Amino acid sequence: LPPGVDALVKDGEEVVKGQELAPGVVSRLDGVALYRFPRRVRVEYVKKERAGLRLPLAAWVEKEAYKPGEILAELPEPYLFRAEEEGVVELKELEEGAFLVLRREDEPVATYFLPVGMTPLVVHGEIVEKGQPLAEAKGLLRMPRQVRAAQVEAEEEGETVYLTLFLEWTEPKDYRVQPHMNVVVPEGARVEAGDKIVAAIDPEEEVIAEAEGVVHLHEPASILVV
Partner 1 sequence: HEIGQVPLLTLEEEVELARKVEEGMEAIKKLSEITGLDPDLIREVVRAKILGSARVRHIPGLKETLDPKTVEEIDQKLKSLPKEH
Q: Give the whole-angstrom CA distance, residue 86 versus residue 109.
A: 8
Per CB under 8 A, the list member of 179, 194, 204, 226 interacting with partner 1 is 179
CB of 12 to partner 1, least distance (A): 19
Q: How many CB atoms lie within 10 A of CB 202?
A: 7
Does position 119 interact with partner 1 (CB under 8 A)? The reply is no
Question: Toward partner 1, which CB reaches closer, 193 or 221?
Answer: 221
CB of 222 to partner 1, least distance (A): 8
Q: What is the 3-state secondary structure (H, E, C) of 51-113?
A: EEEEEEHHHECCCCCECCCCEEEECCCCEEEECCCCEEEEEEECCCCEEEEEECCCCEEEEEE
CB of 179 to partner 1, least distance (A): 5
Does position 4 interact with partner 1 (CB under 8 A)? The reply is no
Q: Comparing C-alpha atoms, which of 16, 23, 4, 3 is closest to residue 225?
A: 16
Does position 221 interact with partner 1 (CB under 8 A)? The reply is yes
Does position 175 interact with partner 1 (CB under 8 A)? The reply is no
Does position 176 interact with partner 1 (CB under 8 A)? The reply is no
CB of 116 to partner 1, least distance (A): 41
Q: Give the whole-angstrom CA distance, residue 197 versus residue 41.
A: 9
> Segment 23-62, which members bind partner 1 (CB under 8 A)?
37
Per CB under 8 A, the list member of 48, 92, 104, 180 interacting with partner 1 is 180
Question: Toward partner 1, which CB reaches closer, 189 or 199?
Answer: 199
Whether 75 contacts 59, CB under 8 Å: yes
CB of 170 to partner 1, least distance (A): 29
